[PDB]
Ligand binder design. Sequence first.
Ligand SMILES: OCc1cc(F)cc(F)c1
Lengths: 375, 383, 382, 380
Amino acid sequence: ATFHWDDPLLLDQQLADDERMVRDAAHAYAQGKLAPRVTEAFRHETTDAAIFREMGEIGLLGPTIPEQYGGPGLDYVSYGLIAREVERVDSGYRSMMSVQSSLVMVPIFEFGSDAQKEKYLPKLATGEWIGCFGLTEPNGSMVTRARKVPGGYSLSGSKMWITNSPIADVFVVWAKLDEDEIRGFILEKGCKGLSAPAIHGKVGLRASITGEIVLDEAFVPEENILPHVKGLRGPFTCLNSARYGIAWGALGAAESCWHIARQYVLDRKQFGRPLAANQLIQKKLADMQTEITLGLQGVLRLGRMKDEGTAAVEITSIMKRNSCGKALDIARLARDMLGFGVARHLVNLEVVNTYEGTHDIHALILGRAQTGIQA
Amino acid sequence: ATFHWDDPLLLDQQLADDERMVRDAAHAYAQGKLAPRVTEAFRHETTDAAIFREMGEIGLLGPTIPEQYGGPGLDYVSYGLIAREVERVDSGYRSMMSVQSSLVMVPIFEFGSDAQKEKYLPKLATGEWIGCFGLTEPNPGSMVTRARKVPGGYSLSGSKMWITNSPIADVFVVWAKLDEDGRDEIRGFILEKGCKGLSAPAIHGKVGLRASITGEIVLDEAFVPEENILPHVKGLRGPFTCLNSARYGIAWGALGAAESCWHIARQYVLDRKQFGRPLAANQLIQKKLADMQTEITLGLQGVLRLGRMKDEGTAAVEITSIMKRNSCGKALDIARLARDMLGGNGISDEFGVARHLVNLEVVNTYDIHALILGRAQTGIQAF
Amino acid sequence: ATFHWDDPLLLDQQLADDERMVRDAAHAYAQGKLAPRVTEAFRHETTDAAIFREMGEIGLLGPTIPEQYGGPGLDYVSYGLIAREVERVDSGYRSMMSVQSSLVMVPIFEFGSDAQKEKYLPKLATGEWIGCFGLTEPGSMVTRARKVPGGYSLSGSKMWITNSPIADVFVVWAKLDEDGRDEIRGFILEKGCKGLSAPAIHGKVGLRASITGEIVLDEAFVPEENILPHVKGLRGPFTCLNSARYGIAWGALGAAESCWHIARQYVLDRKQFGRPLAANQLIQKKLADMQTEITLGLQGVLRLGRMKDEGTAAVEITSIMKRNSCGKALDIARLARDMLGGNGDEFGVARHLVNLEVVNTYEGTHDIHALILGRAQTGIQA
Amino acid sequence: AATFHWDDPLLLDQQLADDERMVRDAAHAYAQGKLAPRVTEAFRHETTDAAIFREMGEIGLLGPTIPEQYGGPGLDYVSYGLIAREVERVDSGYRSMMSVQSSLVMVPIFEFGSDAQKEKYLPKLATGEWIGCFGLTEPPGSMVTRARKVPGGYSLSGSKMWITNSPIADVFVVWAKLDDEIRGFILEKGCKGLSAPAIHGKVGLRASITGEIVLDEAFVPEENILPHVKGLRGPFTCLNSARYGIAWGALGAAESCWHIARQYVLDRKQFGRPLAANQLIQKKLADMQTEITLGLQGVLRLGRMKDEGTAAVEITSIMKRNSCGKALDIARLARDMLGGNGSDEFGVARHLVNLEVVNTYEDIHALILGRAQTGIQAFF
Ligand SMILES: OCc1cc(F)cc(F)c1
């Protein structure tokens, strides 16, 4: 009976062996390739699309996509472990990857035609083609609209804060159309009326490239609309999948913060003694450990529930709210101990925590589910 | 796949049918026998000794103690489940039970002689014998209750304070320093009701845990036969092994109390109206219920996992610190959150919360666990 | 220059000497007469009416009421200092005195006829007559005055009225019809005249040391000469509340000082690992937070008091101080309760704690003061 | 009924003497006029500018408590605070540059220096013609940096790290052990043995320049040792003065974050209303206004006390901890009210990172206050 400060509940022992190598894969990749890049990349907001090629080579894009389509046919827990390990380096990297996996690949696999699945998935899976997701507009009821035309759609609108957009080959875009239903459309790079100007001067997620998608009478052929989804269900299946992945990821960022802070305090001294000798510092460390340890249990359990089909979408709201909130708290706690990879993790998480608005959308999904009553 | 707001992670489906049965049985007893008693018992600080035989005859005392000695020989997860169903009603009753199991029966089963084990456990198991634990003094290693050697055994003088069960106890597990082979070490002694120089006056007018009887143990040259000393333990390890067992039970029990305050809070916001709309429609009210659900759900995954690890023998003692500190701290936050949601002033049943609140303020004092964790993380002691 | 840990900003020296003697008189009275009573009174929810004569005797009832009506003619700073000294012992008691001064004497003084003033204030000032105040029910109030022969008939029920079961004088706010138009008017009523009931409330979780009841109006008759003539609508009730709130703001800070002091003496006295608890860094941060919040909270009510004496204080300022004093007293009592072991004398803290939980939730659980303040900042009613 | 000022609930403005109010407006006109337009690029590219010293010197805002006699503007502590607050309202880096001159340079020359040193350094420090720095921190401790007697003065050897102003400073106030007490010395730029290497890539306080003071047998003349101080009393008096200014400044930053958050929820709509209409936003706004209003009274009261000589050193711990900690809370609260990522409102992201650093120079104040309350020391 031996104590592991860094893994108190021996998560290692709760993973399948299959799951444990996915994790180490993602780990070796993130540490070997992303850690040496991240500092200058964050600092200068530098576009590097190498992550796609690289991650695609080792089978980490579209983790839940079947082998039939070039995916690695893994389960949800593996998806989670992958995101955890990448965010352990940087939220911006994780972000790029959850765009490929949850925001582009998943809607094509789930909602697309045979022909669409065959054309896009395999190249997405290898990261030869990079994808982006256009739902968000400038300040789920969009004005971006598709109208029917000769064979057969024309899109006009704007989508703001689209990660990958300026380098994307493939575009999953959501617009209204009637016979008013929200629909998903597949556009490709270099297409008439489609542009994607980059955004610079970000405070957080500076290691990912972000842009808009500007659609000025952009022509989508009939064969490019997602056949098997209409309405909220489409965007929502995508966000639900991504929020799951962000819930594991945020914990990775938090672990980094905890380790850096722990190591900092071991190594530096005050009044002839390490900071670690300090009770206040020990309390803070105790809380980081605790919140992270519990969070991991929550996401592990949600992942198992997804895999066996026993998980309602509302669970994802618990884990995503919690994971981001506590990761943010932990980063701030770690920051106020130092006298700086932590500062990076901190502004990242500041963006990540408020991404889905400022009125705590998940607290409400959950309030409504407990009470029956909408806020 | 259906959402279960009251069990989001389907804890119910993470259990063996085995443990599920023990849970339901604990629940039926708590709700059928302890719920009716609780309001008056708490308001009037009433002594109900009859509770131990009730708990005992259905195998709630000494969950983990083997059948050889009258226990049900259940695993740690079952013990947890039992603690949680009882505290769901009141921390004071849980206190009664956690003392019997972890602080009386455990040191005996674990440290005592074969004669001691057969003498004491079976009666402690059925509840015929009420036990208690004498460790806290008026003002751990700096203990002052003294055992000195005499013909026929030992003679103990000293005082213990805040000992739950003592005024109604038949059996007393008492920790005292015995200087021997030179060496001054902590030893355990079993005493019995009626023994000369042992008195257990009761303490009344408690602020919390009023449904549970507490008093003192006053040792005045009380005679303990040489066959009433715990043969197999010396020093900190004795008292510690017991508290560690108790903290595990408390880590589960506290979550039951938090579930009640949550459940009460939720019902209250449904039934109340404000500005025509029910209280449930307010955004701030929904944050608070979300926070409550979150912390409870996660705290449960925490104690379940620790349970599995103890049954596997893979759990280190430090893990208990995290779970006890988290369960008690988060349950005390939830009680304060639910208490602040009620307007008015204690007439209503939904001021069951006020009782849970004050209980949880005692339990949270029975920071040190942060220090255990900080030390484990760093290798430097800061106590 | 020395440091007074118990009064870092030397509030003692920001007071005028007359103000200090007012403070010491309340402190002598509270430590003398209330301190010995409090545990049992709380423990057993007693009625103690004798406190009103006691406070009236030495002129602490309705401090700002002029001598011309039996008041001591003090300012708002002394009102505060008194409320602070009483609550230092117990919130329940401060409340009794709050009701008498802000919720009965003030309305009569600002809104009553000369006759009303001479009939009621002197007796309230001595404590001969005890008062209460009915506003809150189980703008959109439903308690009602019918105009009838010779005056009014009042019907409805007010709840949670401290002093009500032992009150001699009642100030009720009911709505009255005026040629179609409905407006809030204040009425004085006396004990025992037919139609009025004062049934106590029992088994309270906090403020147990203060007797509390309903007011029950079933067609209770009020004469014409008993309607408050010089106010209608919001001004009446609000002028009262805005005065009680000011005293509660000073009071809460008195309760918080008790918790602080008790906590500090408790950790100096208790030993763990052969050193006082006061030696731990986690303990010292908590004590620093208590010292800070109280010191700042005090500078705020002082400035409020002085602005009130100068007629420069806007009504919204009171919302700042009330919310802050109470909210921060609750935190401090919680921080102090969490530093103590044992399970009930240092346990004045448990008492303060449960008092401050009622006080902090008394005006609702929607944080009415944040809204007042948010509306004043942004212009927007939430 | 009197008028409510949401932005000055307790009418701080009214509590101020005539001259005090005038200084406030002076520093405000300067900060809004000269510093505001520079701050976004200065912070972004960590773009050193130093014309500020000479700018603030010219309107008499450097070394506020130094008497007119020595070229100072001869003002009280409240005025010092108000200045710090108007500058920090714009950026903590700028206040920091100004805190070093006033508190960490001109104060010790005035308190502990000879008539000669007072006549020579202060008039040019006051106008911002000479720029000062303060070398105390080492990579006290106790400090290692040592001074040694040599013909007609002292030879100094050692190192100071994280010295703000150092790579641009004309005058150095350095603390060394002399055999064995700590003393302060006035070094001049161009002294042999004095190197001041710059440091780049900070997270916060990016508007200010920081560097080292590497000393290698540096020669100080006899007439450049502070004759009137020995031991901790020297450094501590400087720090204690700087903390007082930091106490006001941090509330200036807290004010900006508050006003920015406020204006932001006015401007943005959600669900058909301004965000300012949400109950929870109102609570946050209330907290911001409460903590700022109360902190302002505390530092004002501390100002009056320091003026009248009744303020113990510990009160400064109270205010500095309160001001920095509450400022940071407020900047975190504002930051969290903002969606988006990188326009005007993200002036908040700047103030937050500044306050993160400012807050992190010294909890140590929690323990100063714990010991004064309990008689027991818990630093080590
Ligand atoms: O002391 C009882 C009380 C508390 C309060 F917050 C307002 C009020 F009007 C009366």
